[PDB]
């Protein structure tokens, strides 16, 4: 859990919000993703079937309707969100090593910049998820007309309801994280002056 | 061949047109139908296939696109066209038997009425063929959306080109028969006065 709190962005300049609340939500998202990765999204493509005899229609329809899986999007989002925290940690380690082998304002500015970057990454991933999948709910039946499928074919999705439930959980957690990051930057600015 | 000439409508009041030309066309139609009945229309339904996994779609699509086979239509047309000729023949046999056990105008009127009825039957069968199958040509691929087929499916017809050739032959023969019957009634009316 210590590695998770390090990846959250806990810093000596962090207030209570960033130290005790943001890290817990980060760990919660990690745990939910670990639970839901291969249990419910494991057979997304192998169980995807269409009512046709045309060879190759299943694969092209699956690629058309799922350009990138939800789990992979959430994994990329978590990696990119955790990157600035470990960047700051490595910078702190470098500064301490330089001190050992031989100011606070630089640390403060680095912390606020990293928080802003985390907010930006969360916002852009929310926007791209909205672009790819406008509705939070997943449907049982889809209509596919991509070549080589003739006319329009019916295709069926695996576990729509469970995927909808986990999507709701993940989106709520991401929204809470965005709100907490905005509160963090506002609180730091207020404390500055 | 004598039975065929009897079924054509050969009568003692018949002129050359009805005695030597109409009967030959009748026999020609019979022979072409016998050749084409089971050779080319035999596998019309068993070889009819559609690109789908839906059970029962082949049968409903075949029934939708072929309400009655061409061969059965031609068989019914031949039977109904040959009916008045044998009706007249049985009436003549009855008259001769009555004469044996004990006028010409009755025979003349019966002959002209039978020719008119043959013309009407040929015309109505031509019209119903035009209603069911507007084009003389048969296509390779058809689009079917009848329940329970989902959306629209592609279905493939057996031997479209050979069926088109035989359809052209049969339609030309029927048209020639219609023209000859009209000429027969006109010639009989002219000879009457």
Q: Taking the CB of residue A105, how many other CB atoms lie within 10 A of it?
A: 7
- Bridge partners (DSSP) of residue A156 are A49, A141
Cα gap A161→A167, rounded to integer Å: 10
Would the CB atoms of B154 and A153 count as touching at under 8 Å? no
Q: Which tokens hold the place of A94?
A: 């470098």
Cα gap A106→B173, rounded to integer Å: 102
Query: CA-based diameter of chain A, in Å?
Result: 74
Cα torsion angle, B90, B91, B94, B95, sign? negative
Of A51, A150, A154, the CB nearest to B154: A150
CB < 8 Å to A143, chain B: 151
Q: Taking the CB of residue A155, how many other CB atoms lie within 10 A of it?
A: 21
Distance from the A151 Cα atom to the nearest Cα atom in chain B, whole angstroms: 6
Would the CB atoms of B153 and A154 count as touching at under 8 Å? no
Contacts of B138 (CB under 8 A, 6+ apart): B157, B160, B161, B163, B164, B167
CB < 8 Å to B54, chain A: 51
Cα gap A150→A7, rounded to integer Å: 49
Q: Which tokens hold the place of A21?
A: 């609340």
CB < 8 Å to A52, chain B: 51-53
User: Closest chain A residue to B54 measured between Cα atoms?
Assistant: A51
Q: Residues before each break in chain B (C–N > 2.5 Å)? A: 102
Q: Which tokens hold the place of A54?
A: 């045309």
CB < 8 Å to B143, chain A: 151
Q: Taking the CB of residue A120, how many other CB atoms lie within 10 A of it?
A: 14
Q: Residues before each break in chain A (C–N > 2.5 Å)? A: 102
Would the CB atoms of A151 and B154 count as touching at under 8 Å? yes
Would the CB atoms of A151 and B151 count as touching at under 8 Å? yes
Cα gap B18→B16, rounded to integer Å: 6
8 A C-beta contact, residue B152 and residue B30: no
CB < 8 Å to B52, chain A: 51-53
Cα torsion angle, A8, A11, A13, A15, sign? positive
8 A C-beta contact, residue A48 and residue A141: no
Distance (Å) of CA B2 to CA A99, B5, B23, B76: 124, 5, 10, 21
DSSP codes, A1-39? -HHHHHHHT--TT--HIIIIIHHHHHHHHHHHHHHHHHH
The kind and range of the H/E element at B153 are: strand B153-156
- Bridge partners (DSSP) of residue B141 are B156
User: Closest chain A residue to B151 measured between Cα atoms?
Assistant: A152
Distance (Å) of CA A73 to CA A77, A133, A161, A174, B11: 6, 12, 19, 13, 90
Would the CB atoms of A143 and B151 count as touching at under 8 Å? yes
Structure determination method: cryo-EM
Query: Which letter, b or e, does each residue of B125-164 get, where b requires 16 or more Cβ atoms within 10 Å of its Cβ?
Result: bbeebeeebeeeebeeebebeeeebbeebbbebbbeeebe
Distance from the A81 Cα atom to the nearest Cα atom in chain B, whole angstroms: 45
Q: Taking the CB of residue B123, how many other CB atoms lie within 10 A of it?
A: 14
Cα gap B152→B146, rounded to integer Å: 8
Structure resolution in Å?
A: 2.3
Taking alpha carbons only, the member of A155, A139, A54 closest to residue B151 is A155
Contacts of A171 (CB under 8 A, 6+ apart): A126, A129, A136
| Interface probe, candidates A51, A147, A155, chain B, greatest B C-beta count within 10 A | A51
Residues in A lying within 8 Å of B, measured between beta carbons: 51-54, 143, 150-154
A155 φ, ψ to 5°? -130, 150
Q: Which tokens hold the place of B176?
A: 């020639």
Distance from the B3 Cα atom to the nearest Cα atom in chain A, whole angstroms: 52
CB < 8 Å to A150, chain B: 51, 153-154
Cα gap A9→A118, rounded to integer Å: 9
Task: Provide the Cα torsion B62, B63, B69, B73; round to 10°.
Answer: -160
8 A C-beta contact, residue A52 and residue B51: yes
SS3 B142: strand
Q: Which residue has the tokens 């006319």?
A: A151
The C-alpha angle B169, B170, B173, rounded to 5 degrees, equals 90
| Interface probe, candidates A151, A152, A155, chain B, greatest B C-beta count within 10 A | A151
């Amino acid at each position: 859990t210590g590695l998770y709190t390090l990846l959250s962005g806990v810093n000596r300049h962090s207030t209570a919000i960033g130290r005790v609340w943001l890290s817990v939500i980060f760990i919660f998202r990690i745990m939910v993703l670990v639970v839901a990765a291969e249990s419910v999204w494991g057979d997304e493509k192998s169980s995807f079937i269409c009512n046709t005899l045309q060879p190759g229609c299943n694969s092209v329809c699956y690629d058309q309707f799922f350009p990138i899986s939800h789990v992979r999007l959430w994994s990329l989002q978590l990696i990119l969100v955790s990157t600035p925290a470990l960047l700051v940690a490595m910078h702190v380690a470098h500064q301490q090593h330089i001190e050992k082998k031989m100011i606070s304002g630089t640390l403060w500015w680095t912390y606020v910049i990293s928080v802003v970057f985390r907010l930006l990454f969360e916002a852009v991933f929310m926007y791209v998820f909205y672009l790819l999948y406008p509705g939070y709910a997943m449907v049982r039946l889809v209509k596919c007309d991509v070549y080589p499928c003739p006319n329009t074919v019916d295709c069926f999705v695996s576990r729509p309801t469970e995927k909808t439930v986990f999507t709701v959980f993940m989106l709520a957690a991401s929204g809470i994280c965005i709100i907490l990051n905005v509160a963090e930057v506002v609180y730091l600015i207020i404390r500055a002056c």
